[PDB]
Structure formats: C-alpha cells, structure tokens
Amino acid sequence: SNFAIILAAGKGTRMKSDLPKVLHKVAGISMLEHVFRSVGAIQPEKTVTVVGHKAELVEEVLAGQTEFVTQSEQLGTGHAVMMTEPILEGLSGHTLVIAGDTPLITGESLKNLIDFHINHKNVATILTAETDNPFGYGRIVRNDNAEVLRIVEQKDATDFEKQIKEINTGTYVFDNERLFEALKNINTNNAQGEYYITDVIGIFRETGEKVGAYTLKDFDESLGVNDRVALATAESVMRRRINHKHMVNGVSFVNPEATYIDIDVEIAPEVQIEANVILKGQTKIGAETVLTNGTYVVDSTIGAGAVITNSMIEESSVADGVTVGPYAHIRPNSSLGAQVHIGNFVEVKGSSIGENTKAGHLTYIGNCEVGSNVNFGAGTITVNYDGKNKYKTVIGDNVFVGSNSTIIAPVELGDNSLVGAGSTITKDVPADAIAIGRGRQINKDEYATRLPHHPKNQ
Amino acid sequence: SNFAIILAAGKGTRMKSDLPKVLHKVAGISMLEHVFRSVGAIQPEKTVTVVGHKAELVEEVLAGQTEFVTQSEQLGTGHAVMMTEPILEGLSGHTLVIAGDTPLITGESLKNLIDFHINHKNVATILTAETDNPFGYGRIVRNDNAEVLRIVEQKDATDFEKQIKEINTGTYVFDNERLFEALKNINTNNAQGEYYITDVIGIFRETGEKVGAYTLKDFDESLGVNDRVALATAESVMRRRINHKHMVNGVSFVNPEATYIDIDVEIAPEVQIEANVILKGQTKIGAETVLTNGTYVVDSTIGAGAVITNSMIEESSVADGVTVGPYAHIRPNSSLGAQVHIGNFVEVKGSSIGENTKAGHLTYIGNCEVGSNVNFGAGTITVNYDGKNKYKTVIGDNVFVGSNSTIIAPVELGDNSLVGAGSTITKDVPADAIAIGRGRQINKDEYATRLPHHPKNQ
Amino acid sequence: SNFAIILAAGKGTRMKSDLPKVLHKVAGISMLEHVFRSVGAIQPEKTVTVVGHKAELVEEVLAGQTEFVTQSEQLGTGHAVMMTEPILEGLSGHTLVIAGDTPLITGESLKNLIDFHINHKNVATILTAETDNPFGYGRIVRNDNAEVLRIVEQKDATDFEKQIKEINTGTYVFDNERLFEALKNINTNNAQGEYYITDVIGIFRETGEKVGAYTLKDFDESLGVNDRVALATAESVMRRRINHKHMVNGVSFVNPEATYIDIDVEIAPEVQIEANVILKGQTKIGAETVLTNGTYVVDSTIGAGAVITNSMIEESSVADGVTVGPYAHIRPNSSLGAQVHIGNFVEVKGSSIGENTKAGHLTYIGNCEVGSNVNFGAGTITVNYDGKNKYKTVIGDNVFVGSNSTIIAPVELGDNSLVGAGSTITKDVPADAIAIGRGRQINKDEYATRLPHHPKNQ
C-alpha cells in the first residue's frame, strides 16, 4: 500500500496574504491542486491533507478526493505529519510526504521517487535537486562516501552548511511504520522552535536504517514557493510546461514565454497564437484558429478556422469560421453561429447570433435571439434594461438593422425587415416591412456662418 | 563557379502541419525565404531547390530566382541532392548544400563558410556549432587529432556518440564534381532507411580527401527547426536579431524581447517602441514616432512625429504628426493627413482624411473623402452600405459633424457646414448651412415617478 | 567631507539621439536622475554635475539639488572632472566620481564603495565588476599579486588586454586633494585623443599611493549605457528590480519580466497584476486591486478592491471597488466614485462620477458633474463642445440616461429623471420628469421587398 500526506496548514507569512499560501493559483488552479494532481499518479490507498491556517477555505477545494486532518497550531512540518497519526499510524506501506507549496513536482517524478524507494529498499528516500541559489531550502548533508547524514534548515545552518547546493525538495517517501516511530523522537530544539519533519532523517541515520536520495531529472521542478517572487517563478515554469506541450501537439506560438494559457485549456493542432494571448479556465480552441495579440478567452469554446483578433470572450460558444475583433467583447452566455462576424467595439451579451450574421462596429447586442444573415449597421444599440428588469428582442433572418438605430425591447423584427438608420424602434416590425423612427432633415441656408465653428468666427 | 542546393522537399511530420515545414513563417516570411536570402550572399551561378512534399505550394514562393527539381519520394537528404544531378552533375565548382529549415544561418556565415572551404582547399567543409542539447542533430565524430571522421545521425547514434556536443548544421560546401561521385556510394542501410547526405563525409574520409569543419561564430544560428518548439525558438532568435538592428540604428525599445517586428519593416531613428508592439509586412515608421503597447501595424506607412497609441492600422498611410488611439482601428485604404487626430473607439476605412481633421470618439468613417479641419462629434456614423452596394460621402473643409449623427451616403456636406448632433442626414448639406434631422425634446413633468428606475419604485 | 562629481556632458554619439544621453529614461526617469538618487545615499557635502552637450536641457532636471559646471568642449572624462576644479580643488575629503550613464548602480553599492575606500585607506578605489562581454569597458589591469596597475580603454587596449573580464564601472572614490593633483599629469596621448579620468590610476601607481578595487556584489549593476541596446538592458534590469520589490511587498505578478512599472509607483499588498500591465508616473494602486493584461495607468490613484480590465487611465482618481473595462479610457481630470462601473468602449474625460453610477458601454461622458446611482444606457454621448468652447452638463442622482441619447450641454438632468433612448436633449430636464426627443416609429408594410438587402433582390 501507498499512502500520501500533503502538508497545507502553514501560515505562509512570507506570502503576505490573507489567502492561505497553498491556494494561490499557478496557471489557473491552486498550487495545492497541482500537488494533488501529482500525488494522484502514485495512486495512494489513502491521502491525508493536513490543514490548519484557515482550514475552512482549504477544505473547500477538493473536499472528497482526500481525507483531512486539522493542525490547530502550526508547530512545524514534523508536527503536521503527526496530525495524521490517528489515520496512518499502525499501517504498513510507503508513505509519500509532500508540501502543498511545491506545485512544479510532477506525478512522473513522484512515480520515479516511489520506484527508487522500493528498488533500493530505503526506509526513507528524499527527493532532491541542485541549485546555485539554495537560500531558504534545507541542505542535504552527506559524508565523504556520499551517504546522507541529515538535512539542515537554512535558519539552523552554519555558514559552512549554507554553501551546500543539494537541496531538500520537501518531498519524501517513508516506510510508514518507521516514519511515525521516528516522529516520536523529534523536538523543537532548533532556530525556529518547531518540529521539523526533516529531523527524521537524522533519526534513521542513528538507527542505521537505509536513507537514500532520488534526484530530480529537471531541477526546475524543485521550486518551493514561500513568497510572491517564487510564485512568479512557479507561473513561469508551469507556463513553459503547458506551452511546450501545446507546441509539441502542433500549436504555433509567436512567443511561448509570453502567452498565458491555463492548465486545462484544450487547443487543437494548427492553431496559431500570437504573443500575449490569455486563455483561461475551461476553454477549448478548434483547429486552425488564429488568436492574435491581446485576445483573452475565459471558459469558452471556440471552433475551427476562427480568427479572434484582440478581443475578450467570456463563458460563450463561438462556432467555426467566426471572426471577432479587434477590440470586441463577447460576454457571458453568448453563442456566435458559423461564419458570424463581430467587428470592432462591439459587445454581445446573453444573445444567440445565427449563422453568417454580421455586426461590424460600435454595437451592443444584449439579451437578443438573432437569426441568420442579419446585418447590424454601425452604432446599433439593442435596449434591454429599464432600471429594474431585462427584456428580450427577437430578430429574424436577413434583417437589416440600420446604423445608429435604437431597438427598445421587448420587440420582434420580422424576417427580411429593415430598420432605417438613426431610428428608435419601440414596436414590432413585421416581416418584409421597413420601419423608420427619426426626424426629417431640414437645411438652414447660411446658418453656419453664425456659429462658433465657422472659420469667419475665429 | 559557386552553386547552391536548397533542400525543401521533406514531409516535416514533426511539424504536424498541412503546410510544408519550410513555408512556416519566422518574423513574417517563410523559413525557406530566409534561407534563400542567405544563399544569395554567395552569389551562386546556379541555385537549385529540391521540392517534393506539396511541391506545388513551395514553388509558389520565389518561382524564378532559382531552379526547381522534384523529389517524387522523400527518401532522404542524400537522395534529395541526387535529384539535382540532371542540372549539376558534371559541372566544376563549389556547391553549397543547405536545409530549408535552418532559417537563422546568415549570408555572412555562408560567405565565411565558402571562404574557409577555398582557403583550406577542402573537398568538403561542414558548417558546425556546439550545443548542450544536440538531440536530433547529426554529431560530428572526430579522432584524437581532431580530424573529421564522419557525421552520425541521432537515430543511428550509439549511446556514446549521443554525448557529442558538436553538431552538423545541415549546411556544407562540396567540390561539385566529387559530391555527385560520392553520392553514388550511399545507400539506405541505416536506422531511417534513407539516403543520408551526411554519409558522403565518411566516403571522403575513405578516399583520404580533405574534410574540414567551419564553426559558427554564433551558435544560435545553428537551429534546425523540426517542430513548433524549435519554430518558436527560431522566432525568438530572429526577433532578437531584427530588434537589435533597430536599436543599433537609434530606435528605443522598452522591451526588445517582447516586440514583434517583421524582417523587412523600416523604422527611422528616434522612434520609441513600447513593449508588445507588432509591426508587420511592408511597414515603415518615420522619425520620432511613438508606438505604444498593443499597437499593431500591417503594411502601412506612418510618418514622423506620430503617436500611435494601442491601435491597429492596416494597409494605410498615416502622415506626419498624426495621433491615433487608444483602441482605434484604421482599416485598409485609409489615408490620414498631417496632424489628424483619431481618438478612442474610432474605425476609419477606405477613406481619405484631410489635414488637421479630428474624429475623437466612437465614430465610423467609411468610404468617405474628408476635407481639412473637419470635426467629427462622438458617435458619428457614416452610413455607406445598403446590403448590396457601397456609397461614398464627401465632406468639405471645416465641416462640423454633430455628435451621434448618422450620415447616409451618397451625400455631400459642403464647406463650413454643421450637422446638428443626433441628426440623420439623407440629403446634401450646402456649404455654410446647418442641417438638423432629429425629434424635438418634450418634457413630461413627474412622469419618472411612474417608471421602474425611480427610487420610489423599488 | 564627501563630495560627488557626476559626469553628464558627453555627446553620446552612439545613442544617435538629439536628446542628451543621460536624459534618456529608464523606468520613468532619466538615467541621470537614477544616478542622482544613488549619489544621494552618500550624503555629499557638495555635488557637482558636469554639463556640456546641450547643457541647457540637462540643467533643467534637478536644477538646485546640485552645483553645475560647464564643459564647453567634451575633451574627455578626465577633462570633465577638471571643470570642477574651481569648486573642489583645494578641499580635503573623499570625492566620488560617477558617470551619468550607469543608472543601475545603487546608493547601497556607493555607500559600500565609500566604506571600503575609507577602511582600506586608499587614495583611489575603483568600483569594478566582471562580465563575459567587456567590449567597450575599460579593463582593470593587475599584476601577479592582484595589485591594480591601471585601467586600459577598449580603443587603446591591445588584443591581449581585451581578454580581461574585470571592468571599470566608471565610478570611483578619490582622496580629493590627490585627485586634482594627479589630474594635472594627464594628456590626450591615446586612441581617442582625450583626457581620460582613468589615467589617474596609473599616476597613483607611479607615486606608489594606495589603489584599491571594490567589486559589485551584483554585476548587473555595472551596465554602462552607450547605445540603445544597452538602454534596453538598463530597462530590463531596473524593471526586474522594481517588480522584485513589489513582489516582496505582497504584489503578485503573472509575469514580472513583462510588466512595466515606473520607479515611483506605489502598489499596496495583495494587488494582482497580470502580464503586460503598464503603470507610470505618480500612480498609486490600492490593496487587492486587480490589474489585467493591457491596463495602462498614468499619474492616477486607484483605490482598493478595484478591477481595471485592459483599460487606459490618465491623471484621474478611481475610488474603492470601481470596475473599469475592458477597453475603456478614463482621460485627465476624471474622478470615479466608489463602486462605479465603466464598461467597454467608454470614454470619460474631465468629469466627476458619483458613487454607484454605471456607464456600461459605448459612451462618452465629458465635462460632466454626475451624481450617484446614475445609469448611462449604451451609446449615450454628452455633447460638450461647439468648435470653440466647452460646456458643462450636470446630472443628478438616480438619473436614467436612455441608450443612444445625445445630451447637448449646457443642461441639467434633475434627480430621478429619465431621458428616453434615442433622444437628443437640448434643454434642462426637471427632477422626476422624463424627456423624449426622437421621431416616432412608422412601419411600411412590404416595403423591404423593394430594397437591395432583401433576399428576393439578389
């Protein structure tokens, strides 16, 4: 049996945040969730997450895919593991211990760690890495024979030990039985006055039990995030990982170091992404679609062959061949049918737009059901709100909504109808009719010579 | 005589694209075109490009500045060179062989390669580089005396040869006569079952003929692009090269690592470019012009002293001193005269705008001929389309187009005229006249207390 | 006593600019000002800045916090220091000499430099660093005993000296008395025919006086900016420094390598900044505020809990809880009250907006005094200009301004009033009234079948 203990009860003072450190997001999900996903790879029979600081909030995210234990007082990583005793003490197996603030460690690395622990028959295996800047990390102390002696914390380290480049990642595999026994022998006699889980290594060394170290193939994965500088580094590595995956799958990136794509976004092959594109949440991008600089898509599905030019799209569906932008805003609950064109400075919200309809400019379409082949002249405003309630407008197929018209819901524009430009519409317009609601033009000869803008008046 | 063979017939499976690999763009032009430009530096008497996979498409780009030979089946780089036998076999001279997927090799490096081949009197000179990550590249095998023995491909390499850091760039210079003779001795006995051009090196070694290696001064230039991860690296190096050139010429970049300027864009000294600016195609930027974050210019000429603030400009001419933005869109076939101001949320298309005219906000000017000193009030819409045809509007000098007016083409607004705000204009407005086409305001005392928005009704 | 000499009279030919090199900005202020700020840390009793090339302009920036001396002809760094003789010759103390084009040297490093000069009792201490690319920098020549012999300039260096990696940063501390005496012994016998300040090192070596070198702890700080490539590097290092500071203070950055925040911008803890955000000048951001990709804020104060979504805000005040964007433009002299919402394609200028007012779309509010709980329908345009003068509009509390209305200043919309959508308003609207100024809708049955957009006509 394999067990897993995730430490997530720490205060994260260095984060300077009211939000528990492990809940800070990296590429769209909490660091804790990235850790949960990696832990999942070793398929533990039992997973125990230790919560403390604002345990209330932490238990929210994934409150069933693991057991929870509360650490009333954050007395140390070692003490946090102690909190799992009621559930794990007494069982036999291999127990993975991992921090909730090391989101870059992969499930593959954990599986490699477990495999190594088993094959070498260690009582404890430490996941390690090397770095030129080990400040803040426990250092792996070895002897002339490269044998692991112990782990020394930054605060407790001497000037000499601080020069060690091999660091403790905060992840280990322990024989479950021996783990809790060794735990009984740790105390708060250190620079932090805390119960260090790292002290069990020295304990196993005293008993002569086998202690090994499995080194990460990719040292970038070792990042421990204690502050926002490290969080930004975590974002950079995860961003590179996600984008690398998309490029391998056939997606071109003008600049993968500057494109922000969340962990679960799906992107089909042949999609072209310019730099500075943001794709978040449950977003899916279809084949050959082009996303230009500035595009920001959240929880939306975009079809194939679409061209999203510097536009923001939220909780919406965009069909194949659609063109949006530049500077368009497709708000929640919108659906853009096949080959629809939404041009610059257009806002669509809570509306369904039929195939081949076009709204090229300076338009607002809200709470509307719009047919196919409809044309919205520039400046068209669908009026749907009266200060208390929202009203719906239905627009048929092939309707021509004149430029600068004002459509006051609830009304229906029948198939093939035309609304004259500049018109305010307060009543239904029958299919095949035209509707005009505007003042007639009157010219006043020479009147301009009397006004401030005239050249002769300045 | 100098000859050049460009290999561009490969399938590029790793690219996962329906577009032939060599046609993928880097800074605005295909990798193949960057290679063509470098080959041009050695001024070959004959240039032969080998096409195969979708030869149809490849022959499109530059179908005269070189000879073409078809490779029906892609049996290997060696076999591709064989396809040029009908044209080059029998001739005397130095033949450059280069891949169409190594777009960073410069003409200067090729000239250095040729010079070295000649001075050292080699029968074959390989252009090489060193890299910590040689995966996928042929490795340069040498003896204790640093003599070139052969080139071994990744697939065919043993675990030991894979540790070689010196790689084959895929570019060489060969005595033309010996090249084709050695070619007769290559076969498909390898891990890929292909005719490797790299096997001629081992052949020259058997005959004792002189084989040399000329190393790139800049190892970044050695990049071979087989997938989109490498393509993005190619974009990064080329972007750095282009931007470096502009900075040397007096252009300031807030962040040259995040500014996207195509290979042939011209930029005058003293231009200031914020980060995240995109300049594409045949674009030219005049002296002292400021381009702010988000600006996207395609095939346009912008004058001197202009300030383009986060705006998109396409196939247009922008005169000196013009200010555009933020969030403006100058569409194809527009000309903005000197000192014109286009403000936020304005779209100009197929229109000529005279000097000093201003359109500061939420306006659409389409298919219009507009004079000098004209003022477009916010919300002005020029209506030019009836669902079938486009109509033109002519606006004279010093015209004042009232806010939220709707101008229905075809009409002419005469010099100095004024269109009242909120007016729909369907007829010509004479010079010096004013035109008003809107309903008169009527106030209904206390009526608001009866509506949903009123505070007493909620 | 401590004295300081800042060299800022050079021509900066390599900058290819009409603006004196030291005045080019890095993170919002001139390189010269960054140098002034560092010099300030050693609290000199006298500060003398040497000006020459366009001295007029240079004296502008900070024309009181230092003494100025003119160098009529730029004959060299050594000659520039000579220009300070009338003020400093004869005094006793330690004199810091620093270039105006090394903006990354910190006050802390200068304080360390001075401390080292004093403790080692040197007659001259050179601030040095190491770099793999020393091209253009004076090289620090030492003997087998690591003793400083002299500094050799790039132009004057032999092929052998050019391989030296230890460079002169252009900053030194000299015993003031000895400095000017040694200066008497320098001449223009060099590759540049200039009086090199660097030659005084060789002079002190002849007299046997103590010469030391204090090395920068951070080599990035050593950058000497002679062209725009180096200026961009200066921007990158300063940007990293500023952003690092904000992250340490509790601000999260999705990408600190691509976020552009000026040197004096204040940002409260818990603020979240996406990549590609620009904050300039005297900007202040309140706690927990979210700034999304593309936001550009200049000289504005933004409160706590605000969400600025891809919008440009200039010389304005934004209260707590305000939401702006996407694609909004808050222009100079605007104040947005608490909980105000400004949506997409809205422009606010010279206007005060009361608490909880909303303007969600395609609206222009200029020169208006707007009350609380006001609602601006999409397409609303406040008309404030007649081609010569600007007029003000006053809008009371709870006013409902209908979509696509045109409000022609100067007018007042009384409390709770409603302006009908599509209306042009030319007169005051009393409190509790409604005002309607638009044409009534007329429907023409079957008329559409006769128009170009109708399906039966194509």
Ligand SMILES: CC(=O)SCCNC(=O)CCNC(=O)[C@H](O)C(C)(C)COP(=O)(O)OP(=O)(O)OC[C@H]1O[C@@H](n2cnc3c(N)ncnc32)[C@H](O)[C@@H]1OP(=O)(O)O
């Ligand atoms: C900016 C872009 O995106 S471009 C694409 C958007 N395109 C547009 O908005 C174009 C819309 N076009 C219009 O609004 C045009 O003015 C149209 C289509 C209404 C003009 O149609 P026309 O038939 O040529 O106008 P016409 O003057 O003949 O009037 C037709 C009928 O309406 C009546 N009418 C005209 N103007 C008005 C008015 N202001 N109020 C009331 N009735 C009016 C006429 O009396 C006539 O009635 P009758 O036939 O019973 O005598």
Ligand SMILES: CC(=O)SCCNC(=O)CCNC(=O)[C@H](O)C(C)(C)COP(=O)(O)OP(=O)(O)OC[C@H]1O[C@@H](n2cnc3c(N)ncnc32)[C@H](O)[C@@H]1OP(=O)(O)O
């Ligand atoms: C938001 C920005 O960018 S700001 C800059 C844009 N600025 C603007 O849009 C401002 C435009 N200004 C306007 O539209 C103003 O209402 C103006 C200039 C038309 C007002 O002009 P005024 O001369 O003061 O109006 P006035 O009421 O006196 O009317 C002038 C004539 O037109 C007539 N008229 C007025 N309103 C109307 C109407 N709705 N329909 C028909 N005729 C009208 C009057 O009867 C009068 O005729 P008469 O002289 O034969 O009796």
Ligand SMILES: CC(=O)SCCNC(=O)CCNC(=O)[C@H](O)C(C)(C)COP(=O)(O)OP(=O)(O)OC[C@H]1O[C@@H](n2cnc3c(N)ncnc32)[C@H](O)[C@@H]1OP(=O)(O)O
């Ligand atoms: C897109 C968004 O952001 S959504 C939010 C913005 N929301 C809006 O803009 C909605 C604004 N709503 C409107 O403009 C509506 O048309 C309203 C509120 C004016 C309609 O009000 P109603 O009371 O239902 O209209 P109703 O037809 O009964 O007219 C009321 C009075 O005005 C008169 N009237 C109506 N239309 C007109 C007109 N065009 N010209 C002159 N008088 C008119 C009527 O004769 C009536 O007068 P009476 O009571 O003396 O007989």
Ligand SMILES: CC(=O)N[C@H]1[C@@H](OP(=O)(O)OP(=O)(O)OC[C@H]2O[C@@H](n3ccc(=O)[nH]c3=O)[C@H](O)[C@@H]2O)O[C@H](CO)[C@@H](O)[C@@H]1O
């Ligand atoms: C003593 C110890 O373990 N040191 C390790 C820990 O140091 P480091 O100082 O980084 O440890 P942290 O304080 O961040 O705590 C580690 C993890 O344990 C949790 N936690 C902490 C204290 C507590 O009482 N309860 C609790 O649940 C935190 O939520 C965090 O997820 O991680 C580093 C790598 O990232 C290692 O190099 C250090 O050797």
Ligand SMILES: CC(=O)N[C@H]1[C@@H](OP(=O)(O)OP(=O)(O)OC[C@H]2O[C@@H](n3ccc(=O)[nH]c3=O)[C@H](O)[C@@H]2O)O[C@H](CO)[C@@H](O)[C@@H]1O
């Ligand atoms: C056997 C060989 O040459 N190996 C070299 C080739 O490997 P590599 O595996 O990278 O070679 P590729 O398959 O990409 O082919 C090289 C070039 O030849 C063309 N092509 C390929 C096969 C074909 O039948 N016809 C054809 O025209 C491709 O279009 C491409 O432009 O480039 C590397 C550097 O980039 C070198 O380090 C390798 O030593």
Ligand SMILES: CC(=O)N[C@H]1[C@@H](OP(=O)(O)OP(=O)(O)OC[C@H]2O[C@@H](n3ccc(=O)[nH]c3=O)[C@H](O)[C@@H]2O)O[C@H](CO)[C@@H](O)[C@@H]1O
């Ligand atoms: C001879 C000398 O000093 N060389 C140093 C100078 O070279 P470097 O060639 O970089 O020197 P610059 O020409 O840039 O001049 C140095 C500074 O002195 C000022 N200036 C220059 C000439 C003049 O007549 N008047 C004047 O005021 C410039 O405005 C600049 O701020 O800086 C480098 C580091 O940045 C050092 O490595 C070089 O050893």
Ligand SMILES: [Ca+2]
């Ligand atoms: Ca801790």
Ligand SMILES: [Ca+2]
């Ligand atoms: Ca930690």
Ligand SMILES: [Ca+2]
């Ligand atoms: Ca229908």
Ligand SMILES: [Ca+2]
């Ligand atoms: Ca191949």
Ligand SMILES: [Ca+2]
């Ligand atoms: Ca290749």
Ligand SMILES: [Ca+2]
């Ligand atoms: Ca004219």
Ligand SMILES: [Ca+2]
């Ligand atoms: Ca309008």
Ligand SMILES: [Ca+2]
């Ligand atoms: Ca100089």
Ligand SMILES: [Ca+2]
């Ligand atoms: Ca310099």
Ligand SMILES: [Ca+2]
């Ligand atoms: Ca009031």
